[PDB]
């Protein structure tokens, strides 16, 4: 069939011809790689599919139209917008209540695509009342394999309803959705768990108010349990959610720590996947930016030597996150905690990173060195620390920084050199 034949059949008074034409259009959209989406939109068929969605007298044409609209809305933002401007959203929301499960689930998938296009269409799908019918579909006892696949479809759509920012999802909708996400987190299906963790991670990515919404439900312990998963598809979103949560207040970070997340981070800080490593090191840096009891928990879990290893031998992005972890540690830590950090061998890797080309990183490293020196002063071992820094080659790097183009670097390194490395002894 051609688009011309489809157009001729769809404007026919015979329902069977309309159905065959809709089947041909759906087959173009579902079976052809690089489908003719733009030609189909230019043919003006979107209003026709939206109209067929309401033909309860013929469920097949409903199914075919919902499928065609799904594949149209699965492309660019303008194609999804063509779907939205044709009036597809309310028709699909109403089709959610179709007695035939496959039709309702095709409507779920279509709405998921539309909402995944962006925050505007997401808020539109929410505004036309999709959440209640979707949750009604998600309250049914799913005990079959077909029910499992439909649950995957529904969870994916829900996660797209939790996604994107500027604006963030309306708070009323997020609170309407959260209980279902908490329930879904207790399923055994890996895809359902992954999609649910992704929804959680979306909801936690923002100001501390959204983190508080997620945390009050009580999911953090189960999020940590999933963080300990051997499935990367489940661990990755769970780690993103935990990381977002520890960017918040001290009490939210403490919720995460009491859930036992740190006990998983050894494995995460040496993970083969460099993205997982960088994410875990960033999370650790936000944890070491916390209270002294939280730094003490980082110490109790034996994570400091691991962080030294990462700072020493990891890729530069993970080394940058490790630099932030170290500087936050030495900014908020006790003298004993900073001494412990020194005994684990932080000086040489931290200092070797002063050859990096990132000026901000160099300033952060110099700030960490100053914190370490101030702890030493409190102990009266500033001289021993000076000798340590000199013997690992650190004095060379600080002196070289006194010739840096950036004046902040120059002033910082000069301050350190004038304060601890410009000593004069006149002994009798």
């Amino acid at each position: 069939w051609t688009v011309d034949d489809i157009v001729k059949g769809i404007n026919s008074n015979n329902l069977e011809n309309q159905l065959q034409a809709t089947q041909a259009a759906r087959k173009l959209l579902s079976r052809e790689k690089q489908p003719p989406i733009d030609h189909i939109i230019r043919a003006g068929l979107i209003p026709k599919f939206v109209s067929f969605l309401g033909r309860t007298d013929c469920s097949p044409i409903q199914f075919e139209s919902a499928w065609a609209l799904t594949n149209i809305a699965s492309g660019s933002s303008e194609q999804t917008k063509a779907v939205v401007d044709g009036g597809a959203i309310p028709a699909l929301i109403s089709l959610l209540a179709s007695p035939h499960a496959h039709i309702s689930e095709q409507a779920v998938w279509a709405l998921g695509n539309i909402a995944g296009d962006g925050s505007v269409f997401r808020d539109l799908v929410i505004k036309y009342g999709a959440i209640d019918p979707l949750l009604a579909l998600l309250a049914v006892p799913d005990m079959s394999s077909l029910a499992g696949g439909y649950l995957r479809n529904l969870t994916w759509t829900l996660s797209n309803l939790c996604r994107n920012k500027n604006p963030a999802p309306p708070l009323d909708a997020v609170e309407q959705i959260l209980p279902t996400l908490v329930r879904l987190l207790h399923h055994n299906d890996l895809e359902v768990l992954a999609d649910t963790c992704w929804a959680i991670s979306y909801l936690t990515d923002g100001p501390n108010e959204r983190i508080e919404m997620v945390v009050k439900t009580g999911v953090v312990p189960h999020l940590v349990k999933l963080l300990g998963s051997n499935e990367l598809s489940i661990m990755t979103p769970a780690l993103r959610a935990i990381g977002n949560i520890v960017t918040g207040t001290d009490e939210q970070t403490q919720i995460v720590i009491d859930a036992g997340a740190l006990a998983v981070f050894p494995s995460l800080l040496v993970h083969p996947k460099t993205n997982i490593q960088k994410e875990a090191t960033w999370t650790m840096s936000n944890i070491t930016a916390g209270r002294q009891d939280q730094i003490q928990q980082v110490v109790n879990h034996g994570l400091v030597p691991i962080l030294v290893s990462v700072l020493s031998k990891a890729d530069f992005k993970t080394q940058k996150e490790a630099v932030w972890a170290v500087t936050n540690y030495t900014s908020g830590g006790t003298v004993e905690q900073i001494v412990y950090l020194v005994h684990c061998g932080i000086i040489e890797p931290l200092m070797n990173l002063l050859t990096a080309k990132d000026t901000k990183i160099i300033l952060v490293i110099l700030d960490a060195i100053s914190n370490i020196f101030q702890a030493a002063e409190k102990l009266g071992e500033t001289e021993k620390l000076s000798i340590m820094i000199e013997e690992c080659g650190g004095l060379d790097k600080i002196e070289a920084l006194q010739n840096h183009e950036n004046e902040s670097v120059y002033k910082a390194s000069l301050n350190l050199i004038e304060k601890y490395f410009s000593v004069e002894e006149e002994e009798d």
């Binding site: 959209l29 579902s30 079976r31 499928w67 799904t70 594949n71 809305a73 699965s74 492309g75 999804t80 095709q106 998938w109 998921g112 695509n113 995944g116 296009d117 994916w156 996660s159 797209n160 996604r163 992954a194 999609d195 992704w198 990515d205 990755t236 993103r240 990381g243 977002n244 520890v246 960017t247 918040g248 993205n275 994410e279 960033w282 840096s285 936000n286 930016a289 932030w324 500087t327 936050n328 900014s331 908020g332």
Partner: peptide
Amino acid sequence: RRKRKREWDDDDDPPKKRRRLD
């Protein structure tokens, strides 16, 4: 010092749209 919020990226952020094929 400071908590550092997440920076915009898509390391493995899920797919936004899916096409149904047969």
